[PDB]
Design a protein around this nucleic acid. Structure first.
Ligand SMILES: C/C(=C\[C@H](C)C(=O)C[C@H](O)CC1CC(=O)NC(=O)C1)[C@@H]1OC(=O)/C=C/CC/C=C\C=C\[C@@H]1C
Ligand SMILES: COc1ccc(C[C@H]2NC[C@H](O)[C@H]2OC(C)=O)cc1
Ligand code: MET
Ligand SMILES: [K+]
Ligand SMILES: [K+]
Ligand SMILES: [K+]
Ligand SMILES: [K+]
Ligand SMILES: [K+]
Ligand SMILES: [K+]
Ligand SMILES: [K+]
Ligand SMILES: [K+]
Ligand SMILES: [K+]
Ligand SMILES: [K+]
Ligand SMILES: [K+]
Ligand SMILES: [K+]
Ligand SMILES: [K+]
Ligand SMILES: [K+]
Ligand SMILES: [Mg+2]
Ligand SMILES: [Mg+2]
Ligand SMILES: [Mg+2]
Ligand SMILES: [Mg+2]
Ligand SMILES: [Mg+2]
Ligand SMILES: [Mg+2]
Ligand SMILES: [Mg+2]
Ligand SMILES: [Mg+2]
Ligand SMILES: [Mg+2]
Ligand SMILES: [Mg+2]
Ligand SMILES: [Mg+2]
Ligand SMILES: [Mg+2]
Ligand SMILES: [Mg+2]
Ligand SMILES: [Mg+2]
Ligand SMILES: [Mg+2]
Ligand SMILES: [Mg+2]
Ligand SMILES: [Mg+2]
Ligand SMILES: [Mg+2]
Ligand SMILES: [Mg+2]
Ligand SMILES: [Mg+2]
Ligand SMILES: [Mg+2]
Ligand SMILES: [Mg+2]
Ligand SMILES: [Mg+2]
Ligand SMILES: [Mg+2]
Ligand SMILES: [Mg+2]
Ligand SMILES: [Mg+2]
Ligand SMILES: [Mg+2]
Ligand SMILES: [Mg+2]
Ligand SMILES: [Mg+2]
Ligand SMILES: [Mg+2]
Ligand SMILES: [Mg+2]
Ligand SMILES: [Mg+2]
Ligand SMILES: [Mg+2]
Ligand SMILES: [Mg+2]
Ligand SMILES: [Mg+2]
Ligand SMILES: [Mg+2]
Ligand SMILES: [Mg+2]
Ligand SMILES: [Mg+2]
Ligand SMILES: [Mg+2]
Ligand SMILES: [Mg+2]
Ligand SMILES: [Mg+2]
Ligand SMILES: [Mg+2]
Ligand SMILES: [Mg+2]
Ligand SMILES: [Mg+2]
Ligand SMILES: [Mg+2]
Ligand SMILES: [Mg+2]
Ligand SMILES: [Mg+2]
Ligand SMILES: [Mg+2]
Ligand SMILES: [Mg+2]
Ligand SMILES: [Mg+2]
Ligand SMILES: [Mg+2]
Ligand SMILES: [Mg+2]
Ligand SMILES: [Mg+2]
Ligand SMILES: [Mg+2]
Ligand SMILES: [Mg+2]
Ligand SMILES: [Mg+2]
Ligand SMILES: [Mg+2]
Ligand SMILES: [Mg+2]
Ligand SMILES: [Mg+2]
Ligand SMILES: [Mg+2]
Ligand SMILES: [Mg+2]
Ligand SMILES: [Mg+2]
Ligand SMILES: [Mg+2]
Ligand SMILES: [Mg+2]
Ligand SMILES: [Mg+2]
Ligand SMILES: [Mg+2]
Ligand SMILES: [Mg+2]
Ligand SMILES: [Mg+2]
Ligand SMILES: [Mg+2]
Ligand SMILES: [Mg+2]
Ligand SMILES: [Mg+2]
Ligand SMILES: [Mg+2]
Ligand SMILES: [Mg+2]
Ligand SMILES: [Mg+2]
Ligand SMILES: [Mg+2]
Ligand SMILES: [Mg+2]
Ligand SMILES: [Mg+2]
Ligand SMILES: [Mg+2]
Ligand SMILES: [Mg+2]
Ligand SMILES: [Mg+2]
Ligand SMILES: [Mg+2]
Ligand SMILES: [Mg+2]
Ligand SMILES: [Mg+2]
Ligand SMILES: [Mg+2]
Ligand SMILES: [Zn+2]
Lengths: 143, 205, 105, 159
RNA sequence: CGCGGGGUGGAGCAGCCCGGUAGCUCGUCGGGCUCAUAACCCGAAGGUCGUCGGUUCAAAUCCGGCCCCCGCAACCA
RNA sequence: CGUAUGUUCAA
RNA sequence: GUCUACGGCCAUACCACCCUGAACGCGCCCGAUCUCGUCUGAUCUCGGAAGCUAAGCAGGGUCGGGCCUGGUUAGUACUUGGAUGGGAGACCGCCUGGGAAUACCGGGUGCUGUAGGCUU
RNA sequence: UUUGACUGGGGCGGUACACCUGUCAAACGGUAACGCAGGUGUCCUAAGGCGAGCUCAGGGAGGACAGAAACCUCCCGUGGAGCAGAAGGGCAAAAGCUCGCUUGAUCUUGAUUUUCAGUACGAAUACAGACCGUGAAAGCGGGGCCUCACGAUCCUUCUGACCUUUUGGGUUUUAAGCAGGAGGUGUCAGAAAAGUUACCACAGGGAUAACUGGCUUGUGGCGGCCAAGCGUUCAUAGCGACGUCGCUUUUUGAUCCUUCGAUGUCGGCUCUUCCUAUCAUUGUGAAGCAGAAUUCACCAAGCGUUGGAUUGUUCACCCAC
RNA sequence: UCAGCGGGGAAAGAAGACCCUGUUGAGCUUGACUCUAGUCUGGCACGGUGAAGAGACAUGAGAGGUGUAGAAUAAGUGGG
RNA sequence: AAAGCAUCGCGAAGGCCCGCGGCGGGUGUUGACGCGAUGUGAUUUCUGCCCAGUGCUCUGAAUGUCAAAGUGAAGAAAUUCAAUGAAGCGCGGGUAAACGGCGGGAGUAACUAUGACUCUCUUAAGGUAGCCAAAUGCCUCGUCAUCUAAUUAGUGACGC
RNA sequence: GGCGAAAGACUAAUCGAACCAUCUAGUAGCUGGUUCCCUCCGAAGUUUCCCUCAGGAUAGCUGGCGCUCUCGCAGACCCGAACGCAGUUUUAUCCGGUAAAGCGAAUGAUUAGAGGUCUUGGGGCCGAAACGAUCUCAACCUAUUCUCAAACUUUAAAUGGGUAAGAAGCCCGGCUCGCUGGCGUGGAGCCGGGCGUGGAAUGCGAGUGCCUAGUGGGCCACUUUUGGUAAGCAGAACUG
């Protein structure tokens, strides 16, 4: 458990339309960046809005170009699915272990996952862990 | 377009060759450095004329191209399209820079490549023409015309060497008879009286 | 960085190399009765607003890992803090590196 | 502004000479260094331990301490407007005996020895060195041969 | 001369990000159905991932040059 | 539940 | 005259191809029980003594390559200090001292320490 | 109440703000720019430590499927490979590779080097005292082959002593100490910090921009030299490509020397004078000058160069003389 | 010396308003930092007399299946 | 500013506001045809789409957060730990005459051109009725017509 | 605060916060000024750190005060009877990678022709059923050849940097050690004695402490040198 904080310090103006940012204590992904130098001759400010990494809730913020913004730490990995019990998906590790914790998504995504499992084919889901919570938000298949 | 050549006449900077530290250099104006009958055998063109620089200056690639064309054109008129061989002895390896000033100041002024020049020394040969002896007057006259494409003073010197080789013309024939100068295409190969005796055997076989 | 859960290193109380149980040091809970905290609460009392600086310009993206080494001798349960260099990823007793094996994509 | 790097600018300084790379010849370690002798510091890039700093390469110092693999040397270092006697530890791979001190020490023995024979023989042997005196008078025999006449050569344009 | 966003089957666009396997819709082609066309049904083919290098065991992906196409900025006298 | 169309003249 | 063991300097010793090698040695060489180690007694380790200098190795050779050294290059290039020197400049000459590097042309081809051996 | 700094004015931008490699740098060392080419905030239980064996990149030849490319063998192979990363240096019975064992990346006091004020931090060098690893042993090793990879006071937190104090004494909790780590200040010797002002203010500054003048002349304008070519033919009547040499300050840039206790800013209007690189007019030379017209050139600035529509316009454009 | 005149005195008037610098301000703004009037809300007191209700918590039973197989797997979860 | 238009709060224990303070004071000698707070600006004709964002507002069964006081448990006590859970926030709904916002690429008609038509990406919605080189258009002195001998002007038209 | 049909308008010539007194001689890294004479010495615009860049702290450069020593004589008259150092050379020795040079030496760049020709490809021809024959052009190899390098180099200067040129030396005898060790071995230290030709030239008297101001905007020239077309331009080295 490295001491490295989930909070990662980085500038604001050096953030693009792909970068991950934490807005109002919420991990977010940038969806729009427009700078603006008010005053005849003053500091330019950057206006940026990030849609959440887990929720779809957009988040908006205004920061001086020079100012710095926290960047989140993401642990991403995709594991194949074996079994669904009581809403708790059973997953398999490359280490060889099986943890049946987490949960299926609470929307159209989660339902679409389980029906694939019921049919039975190349299935493996990603595990996104930021801060303290977790969300399985992606699907993949072999070829 | 190009700045006037007066802006890059003097060897003011250290050599700045096209290298891994200098990218995006436009190709030099001059590409063909040898023209005429390059294949002619060493013994066909004994007379050699050189244009020698009398200043320590920079000659642009465009300047080298214009003189090459000017000398070539006249030599075809006076001796024939195959009565000589012209070699430009300067290759533009020095990259000159330009700090493009388009309507900020001298901040970050280190320029971008603009072209290439050939840093010439006092007495360095600029271009050489080898032909038959009967065409000496034309080679001086052809080299006289090419002088007007260069800045500074140039001198035309008829070399006492044989053709484009480094051996004196008055003794070139003797060394060839004694097998110390084997004709090797354009030039000759010097046969040192050393090395395995087998090589001496073949030569005299 | 992988560090084993155990290592044989010098024990100050034993005066000799002993096996040591290696864990990761974590900061304790602030006492709230520490002199510095008792002063801070007394200073912040009443009006005046914030009386001490609040550091904001964070720049470090790592921390120095401190290992809590404990002597395994039952009569000497001595602990010593040993710090290693900054690292983004740290695990105790991870699976060791092997050579000449397939990547497994 | 340059870097403060400890080995900046030592590309050629600490490089090995051409065709002199590889194993360090062992007479280097067989040399004996005692307190008080004079050593030339010359860092060698093959051995990265006990390196002298670049400011001490080409400097000459006096040994004041001897250890298992290294010696303590007192070297004069000019710091702006003052010279400091710096005590540096360098492994013996980067030093060698100053031949100048060895030549002088030989002359002291020779002077002291020569003085003893000057007493048992009267003669006065010169001990102090003398700057090259003006050449004494001499004759120069032509040996019949008239001196060759030299003339400047005509200019020839060699291009 | 700056800053950013892109170039991926015939068209539009994912994949990038988040190195291991190029996909969606439409179109194209072949066979049904129909008297015939479309609609509908069953299938199939199709991409140098702008180009050149580098990293890597492995590059559409990471990094660096060049080309192309689009936006932003250019203020106080 | 849910589909549209059928080039010009010509008995 | 020369070897072996351990070397110092580390090509004047290296590299290619060749000729020769008495003696002792060093080798190759024979074998795997033991010691030891290998897919393989090839290597490594061990036990030997039928054969051979074929090889290694040693000495020599070669208008040999390399290397070392000298000449030439050349008082040339460059350079310390100097001038109310020249020249529009670029640059150049002089005075005062220092002084290189190719190509090209010769010569050389290990020296040596300690200990032990061999050569009527 | 704050709203950093550097800066060829300031803002935008960049970080040249803390560092590392090669260069600049002028053969000790030191040496600047918003100089050039790059790199850093990491990575590693081995990629640390020791020992052992081994030799790499590449190429040639050969060998079932097997081919440019799978694996096996021989030969050549001074390193043309690899050593985490940028680069430079270093390294071949190794510093590379493979294997075995390990925790010298441990505990402790000083000295020294680097930056340097010769302070600190960081990093490093050589020892010493313990306790260990490895190897038969010599020996090597207190992190990474070397040159970067990091952080004061206060505070907090943890670890060590049958430790000191906790205030009249005693026991216990608690709190405070001493020593060593960590939590971090990247503006990296380390404030806790958003804008606007054309409604503006003060102290100043020609240390510093906007106008004038100066230097410069890329750019703008004008001229020459050579002569491929154009010119029914014919380089040069008139032209002049590829090149190349200049002049001017009538454009714009570049610079910031003068002026910020003030040199009134554009344009017009009015008025004088001056320059010539001559449009006309006087005298001429040349023609691809029959005449007329036109073009080129010389002496030449004496004299003249206008009336209006649109535009604040300089500039344009058109109408008319 | 007189009347004029407006080329020059980089004429006078004013410690440049522009611009920059100052670890100098002020007017205004806000997602700047730190506060605050007010306001919302909870608690304690003033704060009393009746009446009828509820919840949590702990203690012990003896029950809690059901498309399915068994014919009650009360529901699981182990050692079995 | 204005009439006109629209929106918002409030039934008095109230709305809006004053005030250091007195449940003091203004509106108020008032009572929704009133008072208070905003926008727009006569009349005429219209006032489209968007509740994703930011406001505002409604709701509070219930989960997630959530202070002081209280309650419990351990302890010699200081103290610690737990349970409990106000408003607010979060969660959900409404609201644009609240602040405000209102899209790209490609193909296509039997001359050509163009494109009613179709494909595809995509938004909260993709600028509707209108109007225009406008006191609002860089390019620009836009293009056409008119006005003049001549128009960077004017006017009419056109509108990616 | 008022008041404003709203211009930040008006509120006693005052308004984007009136006027009066006080706090208050408010603070200013900023501008200006800073008063007699002579005498002697006499700078700095550079280093490091600083929310530092118009300022400071720091070292340097300065002055003042000293102190510690060295150097005197033949004579009332006349008359003889070195402590140490250095903006320098010399001698010895070490250091270096610039100038130049080099590329038929590595690395990188680069022009031409020649000869081979195993293989590799193409053109083309015979053959043409099949290989096959044959020629050419390339690639490839070999020997040559043109031209180059701040971030290349085998070589390699000039100028330059360090050190040494004795009495703290040398020579001989002895002793101590817990270090080292086959060995009174090695090393170091201590004690006693002996030895002056003061062991290159030239010049000069040195050593040492305290207190300390101003400065910390620089600018120019030769030569070297970076950016820039260039600049009475911007930035360095060296000495003046
Ligand atoms: C930066 C802080 C720790 C540092 C190691 C540190 O020492 C800070 C130091 O004490 C500041 C003092 C020093 C000074 O001498 N006197 C001053 O009074 C302030 C902390 O970091 C966080 O943990 C949270 C970091 C998130 C940011 C919010 C708060 C910082 C809290 C922690 C104080
Ligand atoms: C942008 O155009 C301009 C800018 C400044 C000035 C004034 C200055 N010019 C010279 C002096 O410095 C000053 O004259 C005065 C009186 O202040 C004029 C025009
Ligand atoms: C520039 O505009 C200046 N001369 C005038 C400023 S107006 C406030
Ligand atoms: K530098
Ligand atoms: K550098
Ligand atoms: K018909
Ligand atoms: K043999
Ligand atoms: K040992
Ligand atoms: K700072
Ligand atoms: K010009
Ligand atoms: K001024
Ligand atoms: K409150
Ligand atoms: K009321
Ligand atoms: K909305
Ligand atoms: K809303
Ligand atoms: K080369
Ligand atoms: K000072
Ligand atoms: Mg230059
Ligand atoms: Mg000329
Ligand atoms: Mg309080
Ligand atoms: Mg090391
Ligand atoms: Mg139809
Ligand atoms: Mg039909
Ligand atoms: Mg019909
Ligand atoms: Mg019919
Ligand atoms: Mg055998
Ligand atoms: Mg033999
Ligand atoms: Mg030879
Ligand atoms: Mg020689
Ligand atoms: Mg600034
Ligand atoms: Mg610093
Ligand atoms: Mg240097
Ligand atoms: Mg130097
Ligand atoms: Mg140097
Ligand atoms: Mg390296
Ligand atoms: Mg080894
Ligand atoms: Mg450092
Ligand atoms: Mg030790
Ligand atoms: Mg180590
Ligand atoms: Mg404390
Ligand atoms: Mg007490
Ligand atoms: Mg710390
Ligand atoms: Mg600092
Ligand atoms: Mg303000
Ligand atoms: Mg305004
Ligand atoms: Mg100035
Ligand atoms: Mg000034
Ligand atoms: Mg003026
Ligand atoms: Mg000017
Ligand atoms: Mg000029
Ligand atoms: Mg021009
Ligand atoms: Mg021209
Ligand atoms: Mg100026
Ligand atoms: Mg005035
Ligand atoms: Mg004035
Ligand atoms: Mg005036
Ligand atoms: Mg006018
Ligand atoms: Mg004239
Ligand atoms: Mg006139
Ligand atoms: Mg007008
Ligand atoms: Mg006047
Ligand atoms: Mg006046
Ligand atoms: Mg002023
Ligand atoms: Mg003022
Ligand atoms: Mg202003
Ligand atoms: Mg300041
Ligand atoms: Mg203020
Ligand atoms: Mg104000
Ligand atoms: Mg706030
Ligand atoms: Mg109306
Ligand atoms: Mg409204
Ligand atoms: Mg509307
Ligand atoms: Mg709609
Ligand atoms: Mg609640
Ligand atoms: Mg609605
Ligand atoms: Mg069509
Ligand atoms: Mg419309
Ligand atoms: Mg319009
Ligand atoms: Mg118009
Ligand atoms: Mg208009
Ligand atoms: Mg018009
Ligand atoms: Mg008009
Ligand atoms: Mg109009
Ligand atoms: Mg009024
Ligand atoms: Mg206003
Ligand atoms: Mg008044
Ligand atoms: Mg005062
Ligand atoms: Mg200041
Ligand atoms: Mg600070
Ligand atoms: Mg400054
Ligand atoms: Mg001043
Ligand atoms: Mg160098
Ligand atoms: Mg050179
Ligand atoms: Mg050379
Ligand atoms: Mg002082
Ligand atoms: Mg001082
Ligand atoms: Mg100053
Ligand atoms: Mg300064
Ligand atoms: Mg100047
Ligand atoms: Mg200057
Ligand atoms: Mg200046
Ligand atoms: Zn212990």
């Amino acid at each position: 458990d490295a001491g490295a904080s989930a909070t990662f310090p980085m500038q604001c103006s050096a953030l693009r339309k792909n970068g991950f940012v934490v807005l109002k204590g919420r991990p977010c992904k940038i969806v729009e960046m427009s700078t603006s130098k008010t005053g005849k001759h003053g500091h330019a400010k950057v206006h940026l809005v990030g849609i959440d990494i887990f929720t779809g809730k957009k988040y908006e913020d205004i920061c001086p170009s020079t100012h710095n913004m926290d960047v989140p730490n993401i642990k991403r990995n995709d594991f194949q699915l074996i079994g669904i019990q009581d809403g708790y998906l059973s997953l398999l590790q490359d280490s060889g272990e099986v943890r049946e914790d987490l949960r299926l998504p609470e929307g159209d995504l989660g339902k679409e996952i389980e029906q694939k499992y019921d049919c039975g084919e190349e299935i493996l889901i990603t595990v996104l862990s930021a801060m303290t919570e977790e969300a399985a938000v992606a699907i993949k298949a072999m070829a | 377009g190009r700045r006037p050549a007066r802006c890059y006449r003097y060897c003011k900077n250290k050599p700045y060759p096209k290298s891994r530290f200098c990218r995006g250099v436009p190709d030099a104006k001059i590409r063909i450095f040898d023209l005429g009958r390059k294949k002619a055998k060493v013994d066909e063109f004994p007379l050699c004329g050189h244009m020698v620089s009398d200043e320590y200056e920079q000659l642009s690639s465009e300047a080298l191209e214009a003189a090459r064309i000017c000398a070539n054109k006249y030599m075809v008129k006076s001796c024939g399209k195959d009565g000589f061989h012209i070699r430009v002895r300067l290759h533009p390896f020095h990259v000159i820079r330009i700090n493009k000033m388009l309507s900020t100041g001298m901040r970050g002024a280190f320029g971008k490549p603009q072209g290439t020049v050939a840093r010439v020394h006092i007495g360095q040969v600029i271009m050489s023409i080898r032909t038959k002896l009967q065409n000496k007057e034309h080679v001086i006259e052809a080299l006289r015309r090419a002088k007007f494409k260069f800045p500074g003073r140039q001198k035309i010197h008829i070399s006492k060497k044989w053709g484009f080789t480094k051996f004196n013309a008055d003794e070139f024939e003797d060394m060839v008879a004694e097998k110390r100068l084997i004709p090797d295409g354009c030039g000759v190969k010097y046969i040192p009286s050393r090395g395995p005796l087998d090589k001496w055997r073949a030569l005299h076989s | 960085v992988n560090v084993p859960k155990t290592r044989r290193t010098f024990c100050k109380k034993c005066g000799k190399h002993q096996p040591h149980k290696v864990t990761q040091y974590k900061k304790g809970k602030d006492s709230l009765y520490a002199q510095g905290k008792r002063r801070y609460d007394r200073k912040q009392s009443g009006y005046g607003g914030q009386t001490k600086p609040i550091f904001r310009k964070k720049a470090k993206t790592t921390k120095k890992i401190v290992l809590r080494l404990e002597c395994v001798e039952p009569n000497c349960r001595s602990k010593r803090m040993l710090a290693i260099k900054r690292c983004k990823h740290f695990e105790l007793g991870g699976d060791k590196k092997r050579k000449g094996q397939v990547i497994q994509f | 502004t340059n870097t403060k790097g400890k080995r900046r600018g030592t590309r050629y300084m600490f490089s090995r000479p051409f065709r002199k790379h590889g194993v360090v010849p062992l007479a280097t370690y067989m040399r004996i260094y005692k307190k008080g002798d004079i050593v030339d510091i010359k860092g060698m890039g093959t051995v990265q331990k006990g390196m002298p700093h670049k400011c001490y390469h080409g400097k000459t110092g006096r040994v004041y301490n001897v250890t298992q693999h290294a010696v303590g040397i007192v070297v004069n270092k000019q710091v702006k407007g003052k010279i400091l006697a710096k005590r540096i530890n360098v492994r013996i791979e980067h030093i060698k005996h100053s031949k100048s001190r060895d030549s002088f020490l030989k002359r002291v023995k020779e002077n002291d020895q020569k003085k003893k024979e000057a007493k048992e023989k009267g003669t006065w042997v010169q001990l102090k060195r003398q700057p090259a005196p003006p050449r004494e008078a001499h004759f120069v025999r032509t040996n019949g041969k008239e001196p060759e006449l030299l003339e400047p050569i005509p200019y020839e344009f060699m291009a």
